[PDB]
Structures are given as C-alpha cells and as structure tokens.
C-alpha cells in the first residue's frame, strides 16, 4: 500500500529502515496492520496511557525457580518406519512388532486444525494484549448455574487460561494465567513488559498473571494457588507422567463425591488449570520436535492419557474439548488393531499388550462402534487371572495393565445395550474373584495415602454387593503409620464408588438382572456358563430353584438361586429352600481339571461371604487344591461349589 | 463321578470395520473457523417469599426437637433442601415453626450441636446492599465473601457465612416454642 | 523537536523516533504525510510496540535487516522507563 520510511536515533546515529507492507502481507495471509494500527491508538495521551498502567495488576516479584525439563520424545529408532499423518492409507504398516514414528508437522496441523480468536478484546484483555487470531484448541466448562466458568484455551506455542465469576449483581471478576516459553509469549499492548507481570521464571518457561488490581483482590479471597509447586511441576513432569498426575487427582476428587456439588475453592480451581496444561504439554511436545517424527509408542501414551482425561472430565464436570484429536493417528491405530486377534491378546508380551490396549482406546474413540475391544480386554484379564497368586492384592504392574484395559470396559457400561453380554459378564466375574480381603485392605491404604492402589481396583467393577462400612473397616489395614480417620474416610469413598446409584454399577448388561425383585437385598452375582447364580437375602427371586445356606440364628438369610440360560421364571419357587448335599469322598489330588468353568466360594456363618474364586484352568485348580484354602478345622467356614448344571455342592472334607 | 472340563475361553467377536480412507479432513473436522464458548448466568432477585413468615403461636413436640434453649425448641430438618426450600419445608412440616437465623447468643448453642462435616442452612438474608436480617428482624453479622443472599453455619462458624451456591442440599435450621 | 500528544496508517510516509535523552524520558514519535508535509505528534511508546508486534507476527517472512530492526526496537523499548513519568511534568511540552 504505502511504504513507510522510519528514522530512529540509535546511540546518536540517525539510522533509518524501510517498511514494506504488501511484500509481507502477501506472505502472511492474516496480517492486517490497519487493524492493529487502530488498536495501537498512537494518538493516546499520557494521562489515559498511565490510567491503563495503574489499572492492571502488578506482580510483587518473581520466584526465580531453577529447574530442568526432561526429554519426553526419544530419538528416532534406526529401524523405524516413517509415517505421514496426512497420507495414511491401508499399506506401509502391519503388525505390532514394527517400530515407527509419525511426522510432527502434519500431526500438529491436525491437532490444531481449528482456527479462531485466542486473545479476545474484553474488559481485562483489551488493556493487556493485542487482538490475536490463530490456530488453536481449548477445554472449557461452566458450573454453578454458569455463574462461574473457566476456559482453558491454548496454542501450540503458549497457554492462556481464564477464570470468570459473575455475582448476582451482574458484576464480574476475571483473572487469566499465561504459561509457556518466555521467548514466544504473545505481544503486549502499550508500554508493558513481562518482567513486571511474571510470577515465576525458569530457564525457558515462565508463568504470568494477567488481571486488574480490583479483580485480583477479589479472587485471592478464595483462590490462592501454590505457584511455586504448580509452575515447577508444569515443566519438570513428562507429558505422560504429568497427565497421570492430573487424572489421578480428578478421579479421586470425583469418586469421593466432589464435583457432584462443585466448590469454588483453590483446590478445584487449581485442578482446572492443571487439566488445561496437560493438553498443552502434549501439543507443545509435538511442536518441539524440529519438524521430525514422534515414536508411535510415545504418542499412544500421551493420547491415551488425554483421551481418558477427556472422558472423565466430560462426566464429572461436563467439560468439553475442542481440538487435540488426530484422525491420522486414530486410523493408524485402528489399522494396527485390525492385524491382530482380540481373543489372543492375553498371549502377547505384557509390554505389547499395553501397547495394543492404548492403541485400541485411541483407534476406536468413545468405543462407539467396535465393541470387539471388550473381548480383547477380557483376553488380557483372563491371562492375568491365570498368573496371579491366590487372593493376593495384585501388583504394581498388574494394576497398570488392567487399569488401561478397564477404560474401554467403562465406556461400554455407559450404555444400556446388551452387546457381548457374555464377555462383559466374564470380565466382571474375574474381577470379582480377584477382589480379596487383602485387596480391600491394600486399596483402602492406597486411598488414604493417595497412591495407585486407590486409583485402580478390579473391585470397582465387581459383582459383590454385600460390602458395607463395618466390613470394609474390619478388612482395613492395621498399621500405626496410618491416620485412622483418613482410613474411615477412605472407606466412605470406597462405598461411594460402589454405590448402586452410580451409572457403571447398574449392570443392565446382564439379562438375569431382570430376575431381581429387590436389588437392595442382593449380596452377589455369579454369571456362569448356561446359568447365573444370584446370592441374596431375599426369599423372592424369579429363579429356577432355591437353596438356603447354613448360618447362625441372628445372621442374615443366605439365599441362592440359579437362572437357567439367564431366563427368568414366573416367580420364586413355592415352599421352603433346599439344602445342599455334602462331599467327603474326595481327594486333594486330581488327575485333571474337573472344576473348570465352575465357581468356588466360601462364607463365614456370622460374617457371610468371605472369598470368591473361579476355575479357569488346571493350574488354578491345582493351586487351590494344593493350598490350605480348605480349612476344615474352621467350623464357622463353609465351602460351596457352583456347577454349570445349575446345581450346588458343599465340601465336607478332602483326603 | 466327575468328568474333566475344558479351559475357560473368551467368546469370539466380529472383525473390526474397515477404515474409511475417503473421509476428508473437512469431514473429520467440519467448520474450521470456530469461536470460544461462553455462558450467560441466569440472574434473578431474591425477595422475601411473603407466602410464609414467622409463626405466631406456641408449640413443641418434646420428642421431635433436636435441642432446646431458653423457651425455644430447635429443629434440624432431616430432608436435605435448598436454601430457598427451607422456608416452605419447615412451614409445611411442623405446627408453628419457622426458618430461623442464629443470634450472637444462640449461634454458639447450635454450633455445639453440629459436627465438622455437616453444614446447616440458616434464616439469614440480605435486604438491600446490606442490613442482613431474619424473620425476627434485627441485624446479623455475615461473612460476606460471595455475591449471594444465602448463608449457612457449621462447627467452626462464628457468624453466618455466605456461599457461592444456594442450590446445594443441606439440613434446615428452624425453631418453635 | 519534543511535542505534546493530545489518521489512517496509509497516510503516514515517514516516522521519526528519538532517544530517552532527547525529551527527558518522554518517548515521542513524529509522523508525517508526503510536495506537502503535515506532521503529527504521536505516542512513541505505542508506535514502538506497534512495529515490534508486526515484525514478530511476520517473523517468518522477515529479511536480515528487518530482524536487526526488531532487535533494535526491542532494545530501545526495553530501555524506555515508564514509572519515571510519575515525577515528570506530563505537560512539559504542552
């Protein structure tokens, strides 16, 4: 349009530069100096300029915390294959044993596909930043009648989250937090600089607080974040480890009955910021690749965790996510799953099993179509079942593996659709069998302390319903190193998780469920081949038969009833319950597996159900028969076995 | 006699659907140009629900009240209600009774009947930009934090405390004689 | 000369900037039309931030001397205080 010659005194020297416009605008298809010129307001006098200055909140000083950032993305393996996310097609990659990396450039393009306003011209912003429109993504939500809202907007270069609260007077307060590498932070309006705003500064990264003095004073009444800790963690954690940290907190918060009635305290508000960061960190890590490629395994881990985070927050708070979802990677993951047998995943190296599970989660988003992944998860659980030692509280590794697989299971349980009932039922049965008293103990400890043993537990998806506070406490850890109040609280948390009022406890995937007249009287459900057994305290159930177990005078009734082929009868069988025949003429040593497919349980005459097991293989049968499980010296404990013939037998002894 | 049984197996499932490689980015992500979301809070003004007011007679069921002090009976409505809900909830529950705001004298009495977990809705409200009052009139000290008319008390409350949400469910403080 | 601040972008043909020493800390810019020349007294602080933003926004399209300019402008900008104006006579050049 009109080239401008600019002259400027540089240490006494009257130097000048020429400023072309179209030569650059032609190269930068979104830059319009005219609009910025209007915003520049070069006609602004000193008074109004200073008025803006006095309005904006100033940070007292900067923490100056030194730290080092880890390397999330590893060097490209020599034998890896190169994947172009924009050119994904049926060939090039087949099998899970082939290393590969996906080019960052097209990945970034997909993750930040959407374009819009990053920095709006509103009351707290128009006085700080110049208008910015660019490729971006965001996480956002609103709570408390939408009196309070938060937007976790971010770019591939920097993050900026906004906290907004509106009073009943219509008055509002707004505070924003800017985070990213110092060298590439968004342009400030007028004579302002980041060193006056920055609260934390590291080698590359800094955290900047953007608000007004009046609003700041308001926020501080309830929202007082630990900037030191938050800032450091935001840099020193890896994308995967960071996301896991965030997720665990969210899960524990929700599970204890948190976001049911959201509280506008620091804890929750801080959490929102951390969630926003988790998404940024991944997108950032991709941008920070020098236009190279990223190992698929790394991507699987990073996206898996965000995917889960998305699914959970979208329920707990009802938050939504826009962007950070690459169709290219999803298609590739789906392709990989299509080259393997779901049923046989349990026979793969543990390392590969996790890989496959993560890929599956991403490849088939929201488990909306390919339900076959459930069979996959079951294969994995079953193989684990056959390796896991009797009644032991799993293992760190097992927990991680199962945790990953459990996600697709949880997705299926959100819809009352009877797809692969039999597989889902098995999954729950196996999970139930693994939920020993030791597991309850280990979990409660983990909950009290906030460890991975509280985060994930197969018990959560079990078909055991007779658990209450008193029982869980009796099974609680007995250590002087624990806060006994915290433990009792952990119990309430645990009970909450299993509440019948919780969506994933509905268990409507089980046809037999219909036979239940009183859910509140159900003690346990055991779905076996050609028969589901219901254990309850209610005489009335639409079963094919009815048995009553021996117990003490003051004990709750113990009713057992099979449902043949999961078909409900017209009502309870008239007359008194049957008794169970006893077996004494049986040896501990057996030629082969004769109980495979059968269930084995035991109970205390006073306390009720104590253990559950399920015979899946010879090794399992051997382990149990060779163990001292069958304590025939304990006259208060009885052992029952349930067959696929819809019958039950009691064990009197073993040679 | 017993018969050997086969190992437990997972039920076979269908093969995965094919990948639609003909779905373009435009289809994967429609409407490339987007705008950040916003919400508009619903605002309304609280006014005294003149349908109900301070009861004007004596009454007390000696086995229904939670605690007593001086000449009054104090109740904690068991059913959990919203702050607004308390006004009607008590009026429609007992003979002469009403939603009551704790005094500097009485508040200590009720706080000693509360644990550190529960939170009790109280009959204290803003009239104008201030002059926090109750059905008994008078002026109350309120811990003004949030721009809302509702207040509550708890074990560690020295005054009625403001709160960001009135829609949460809590026991109601009401009295009789 | 120093002036008191109190117009389409395309209407400017030349821009003149000065040091902090010239106008006793008051960062001022002089704008002018293209003969026939009409000058305008402009807020130097705003003018500088304007150009810095443009150069960063178009960083991918800059040439050697433009990157040098960016550094120069940022340097000058960083060296220009604001707070000192609380003591200065804001109408000094009025």
């Amino acid at each position, epitope marked *: 349009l009109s080239e401008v010659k600019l002259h400027l005194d540089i240490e006494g020297h009257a130097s000048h530069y020429t400023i072309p416009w179209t030569e650059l605008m032609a190269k930068v298809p979104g830059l319009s100096p005219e609009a910025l010129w209007r915003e520049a307001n070069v006609t602004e006098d000193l008074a109004s300029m200073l008025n803006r200055y*006095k309005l904006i909140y100033k940070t007292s*000083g900067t923490l100056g915390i030194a730290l080092a950032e880890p390397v999330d993305i590893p060097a490209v393996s020599e034998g890896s294959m190169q994947v172009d996310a924009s050119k994904v097609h049926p060939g090039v990659i087949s099998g899970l044993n082939s290393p590969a990396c996906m080019l960052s450039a097209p990945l970034e393009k997909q993750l930040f596909y959407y374009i819009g306003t990053m920095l709006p011209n509103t009351r707290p912003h128009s006085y700080v930043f110049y208008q910015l429109r660019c490729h971006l993504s965001y996480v956002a939500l609103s709570i408390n009648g939408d009196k309070f809202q938060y937007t976790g907007a971010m770019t591939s270069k920097f993050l900026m989250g906004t906290y907004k609260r509106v009073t009943e007077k219509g008055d509002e307060h707004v505070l924003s937090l800017v985070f990213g590498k110092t060298k590439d932070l968004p342009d400030l309006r007028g004579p302002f600089s980041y060193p006056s705003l920055t609260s934390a500064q590291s080698g590359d990264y800094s955290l900047v607080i953007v608000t007004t003095f009046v609003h700041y004073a308001n926020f*501080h009444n309830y929202f*007082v974040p630990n900037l030191k800790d938050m800032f450091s963690r935001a840099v020193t954690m890896t994308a995967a480890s960071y996301a896991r940290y965030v997720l665990q907190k969210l899960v524990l918060l929700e599970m204890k009955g948190g976001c049911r009635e959201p509280e506008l305290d620091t804890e929750t508000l801080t959490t929102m910021f951390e969630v926003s960061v988790a998404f940024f960190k991944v997108g950032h890590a991709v941008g920070e690749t020098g236009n190279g490629c990223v190992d698929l395994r790394w991507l699987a881990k990073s996206f898996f965790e965000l995917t889960v985070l998305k699914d959970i927050i979208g329920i707990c708070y009802g938050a939504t996510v826009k962007g950070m979802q690459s169709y290219g990677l999803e298609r590739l993951a789906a392709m990989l799953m299509a080259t393997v047998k779901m049923e046989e995943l349990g026979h793969l190296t543990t390392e590969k099993q996790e890989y496959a599970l993560r890929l599956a989660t991403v490849g088939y988003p929201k488990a909306g179509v390919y339900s076959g992944l459930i069979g996959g998860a079951t294969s994995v659980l079953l193989s684990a079942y056959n390796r896991h030692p009797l009644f032991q509280p799993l293992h760190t590794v097992m927990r991680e593996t199962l945790f990953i697989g459990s996600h697709v299971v949880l997705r299926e349980l959100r819809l009352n659709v009877t797809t692969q009932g039999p597989n889902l039922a098995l999954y729950q049965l196996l999970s139930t069998a693994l939920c020993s008293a030791l597991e309850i103990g280990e979990v409660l400890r983990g909950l009290a302390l906030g460890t991975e043993s509280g985060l994930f537990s197969p018990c959560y998806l079990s078909l055991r319903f007779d658990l209450t506070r008193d029982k869980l406490l009796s099974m609680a850890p007995q250590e002087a190193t624990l806060d006994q109040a915290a433990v009792s609280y952990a119990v309430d948390g645990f009970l909450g998780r299993l509440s019948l009022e919780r969506e994933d406890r509905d268990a409507w995937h089980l046809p037999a469920y219909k036979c239940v007249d009183r859910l509140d009287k159900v003690l346990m459900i055991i779905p076996l081949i050609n028969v589901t057994f219901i254990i309850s305290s209610d005489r009335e159930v639409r079963g094919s038969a009815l048995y009553e177990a021996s117990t003490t005078y003051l004990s709750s009734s113990l009713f057992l009833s099979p449902v043949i082929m999961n078909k409900c009868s017209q009502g309870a069988v008239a007359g008194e319950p049957r008794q169970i025949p006893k077996i004494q003429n049986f040896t501990r040593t057996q030629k082969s597996c004769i109980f495979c497919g059968f269930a084995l349980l035991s109970y205390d005459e006073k306390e009720g159900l104590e253990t559950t097991t399920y015979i899946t293989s010879q090794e399992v049968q051997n382990s149990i028969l060779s163990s001292n499980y069958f304590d025939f010296d304990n006259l208060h404990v009885h052992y029952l076995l349930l067959t696929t013939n819809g019958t039950v037998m009691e064990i009197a002894g073993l040679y | 006699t017993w018969v050997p049984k086969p190992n437990v197996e997972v039920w076979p499932v269908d093969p995965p659907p094919p990948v639609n490689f003909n779905k373009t980015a435009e289809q994967e992500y429609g409407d490339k140009e987007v705008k950040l979301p916003h919400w508009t809070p619903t605002l309304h003004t609280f006014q005294v629900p003149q349908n109900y007011t301070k009861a004007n007679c004596t009454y007390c069921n000696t086995r229904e009240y939670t605690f007593s002090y001086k000449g009054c009976c104090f109740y904690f409505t068991k059913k959990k209600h919203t702050w607004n809900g308390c006004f009607q909830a008590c009026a429609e529950l007992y003979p002469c009774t009403y939603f009551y705001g704790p005094t500097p004298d009485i508040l200590p009495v009720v706080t000693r009947n509360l644990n550190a977990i529960e939170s009790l809705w109280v009959g204290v409200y803003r009239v104008g930009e*201030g002059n926090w009052t109750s059905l008994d009139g008078g002026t109350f000290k309120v811990y003004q934090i949030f721009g809302s008319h509702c207040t509550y008390v708890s074990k560690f409350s020295t005054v009625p405390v403001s709160h960001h949400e009135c829609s949460f469910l809590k026991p109601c403080l009401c009295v009789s004689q | 000369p120093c002036c008191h601040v109190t117009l389409a972008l395309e209407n400017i043909s030349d821009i003149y900037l000065v040091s902090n020493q010239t106008c006793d800390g008051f960062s001022l810019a002089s704008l002018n039309s293209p003969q026939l020349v009409i000058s305008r007294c402009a807020n130097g602080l705003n003018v500088v931030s304007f150009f810095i933003s443009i150069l960063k926004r178009s960083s991918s399209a800059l040439t050697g001397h433009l990157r040098e300019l960016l550094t120069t402008l940022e340097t000058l900008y960083g060296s220009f205080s604001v707070e000192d104006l609380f003591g200065a006579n804001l109408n000094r050049y009025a």
Partner: antibody
Amino acid sequence: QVQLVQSGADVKKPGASVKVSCKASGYTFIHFGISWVRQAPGQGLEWMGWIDTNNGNTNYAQSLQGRVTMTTDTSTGTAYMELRSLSTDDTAVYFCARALEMGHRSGFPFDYWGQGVLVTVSP
Amino acid sequence: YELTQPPSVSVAPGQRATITCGGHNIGAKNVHWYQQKPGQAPVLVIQYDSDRPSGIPERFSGSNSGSTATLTISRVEAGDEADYYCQVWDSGRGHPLYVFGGGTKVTVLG
C-alpha cells in the same frame, strides 16, 4: 468475618521500649500481610511499616528504621511490633490492618483495621 | 510523596459534599480514601479511584485525574460527619512506603 484484636497498651517513659501485639482471626493468617500505622491525638495517619506474614519480609518507615522491629508467630496468627528508644513525641494510638500485598513496585489498600492501642510516653 | 488536603469543610445537609486531594500526577496513582469517626478505627470507603466494597452506601463516590483526586457524598447526612484521608502507595525509590495526606475534617450543618 475478619477480625483484628490489639493489646499491649501501656504507659512508658522516654528511653523505654514497648511491644504491641495484634491477634488475627477469621482468615488464613499467612494469606495476607500486616500493616502498622500510628496516629497521635489531633494528628493524621503515619505509615509505620509492613510485614510479610509468610516470608518474613519487612518494609519500615525511614523515620523509625533502627528503633523498630516487626515479627510474627505463625502458629498463633499473632503479629508483634517493638519500638525502642521511646520519646514523648511517640504518644499515639497504634493500629494494625490486614495488608494483602506489598513490594518494590506494588501495594494494596487496607480493608480491615483493628481496634488499636494507646501508648503514652512520659518521664 | 506528600499529598495536599484542606484543613476542614462544613456543608449543608443533603448537599453534594465534595472533598478533594491535590498531588503531582495524582491521576496516575491509585488513590484510596478512608473515613474515621472519633473513638473508631479508620474505615476504607473507596479504593483504586472509585471502587467501593460492599457495606458502603451508594451515595459514596469519587474520581481521580490530573493533579486532583476527589470524593463525593450525595445527599450528605449528619451520620456522614467524619474525618477523611487520602492515601497512596509510593515506590520510595527502593524504600517502598504508604503515604497519607493531612486529612480533612468533614462536618454537616444543622
């Protein structure tokens, strides 16, 4: 609510020393700083100093520096301020106030004030 | 930085009682106003140039520009008789402090 309770009021003589105690209540002590101000009878308000209740950072009036000390007891939420080498001209009412923040390039107003204490100095 | 305030003022009831404070570039600073009655601690009424907290009647206002800051009480009442002070924050050239002006005694006739 927000409360500040002040005590330690007394009558001293020139050369003596006094320590004023201000007790916080109703809020997290460490979340807000504390300001001190003096007011002699018939006079205006003289800023004395400010203390960071969390970090121990202090800012003193130049006219007091060398004869003034501030400190807090975190576990009780109690602030203390000591004056030394007292003079008759130091007869005044002393106040504490809740001071959110202060620093080299910023500071807030004082929303809440304590009752104050009267300190008299006379030979 | 020393602030300038008048000794005292006394006005008719119901009038737009107006109090001013002088200072170099005072408009560039955040001015706070405090009210004090005998036997009582000073109370913040207006902060940051016309921002008022809850508890302050809507008849209280004010502003700040150039060399003059101002506070105004609409329909001044006898109960508004009190001393008022202007306060600013000062960077102190490395020794940051707060400064109060002389203060003004404000009364109402009747």
